[PDB]
């Protein structure tokens, strides 16, 4: 029975995904924070 190797811990794919995830994160964070301050 053929064996198989599991991975555990595309480059520009992960880089664009990382940048977008980051940007989403601080954007949502900053909208939250500004709205609270304005209220």
């Amino acid at each position: 029975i053929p064996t198989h190797a599991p991975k555990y811990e595309d480059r520009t794919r992960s880089e664009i995904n990382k940048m977008k995830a980051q940007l989403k994160k601080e954007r949502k964070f900053t909208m939250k924070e500004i709205r609270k301050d304005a209220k």
Binding site: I16, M19, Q22, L23, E26, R27, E33, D37
Partner: peptide
Amino acid sequence: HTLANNVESKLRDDLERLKKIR
């Protein structure tokens, strides 16, 4: 890509500016 990153840095600068205001 690069424009996205630099405007991202500028908006983080804006964030910290608001907080040094506050």
